[PDB]
Design a protein around this ligand. Structure first.
Ligand SMILES: NC(=O)[C@H]1CCCN(C(=O)c2ccnc3[nH]ncc23)C1
Ligand SMILES: [Zn+2]
Length: 140
């Protein structure tokens, strides 16, 4: 589990969104595994605006932050799970790291700020849903 709290937005994995998220919806994209809902309180996370390919992510199944090298956001084949059928997920970045069921939502961050959230795992891989192109997270 986990979210990005930027301005009056909450950024979560679409597959983990709550009823309150759906009742306060700003934007959702199944192809990216992302959903954004509105918040009453202002958050403290800042979004990175960059093409960093190194950073650090939080792994809840280890209680550890790991430094990683990750691929540029791409259209990556993702295997069928309890949340989605076999499909191409867009804006996904891959790294080598521990990610098991429950690690989705952990933040990936670089020197500039938050890059994305854990969205895939297994096989000693971890995938991150990129948020750096969502410029609207910074206003309104
Ligand atoms: N965005 C998606 O389509 C996700 C949905 C959750 C599952 N998933 C994984 O890649 C995954 C996550 C955690 N541990 C794992 N072990 N084996 C596979 C996995 C795909
Ligand atoms: Zn950066």
């Amino acid at each position: 589990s986990g979210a990005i709290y930027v301005g009056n937005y909450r950024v979560v994995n679409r597959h983990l969104a709550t009823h309150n998220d759906w009742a306060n919806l700003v934007w959702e994209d199944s192809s990216r595994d992302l959903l954004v809902s509105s918040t009453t309180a202002q958050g403290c996370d800042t979004i990175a605006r960059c093409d960093c390919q190194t950073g650090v992510y939080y792994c809840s199944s280890r209680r550890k932050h790991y430094p990683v090298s990750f691929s540029k956001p791409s259209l990556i084949f993702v295997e069928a799970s309890e949340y989605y059928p076999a499909r191409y997920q867009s804006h996904l970045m891959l790294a080598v790291g521990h990610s098991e069921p429950g690690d989705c939502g952990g933040i990936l961050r670089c020197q500039h700020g938050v890059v994305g959230i854990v969205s895939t795992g297994g096989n000693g891989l971890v995938g991150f849903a990129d948020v750096r192109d969502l410029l609207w997270l910074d206003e309104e």
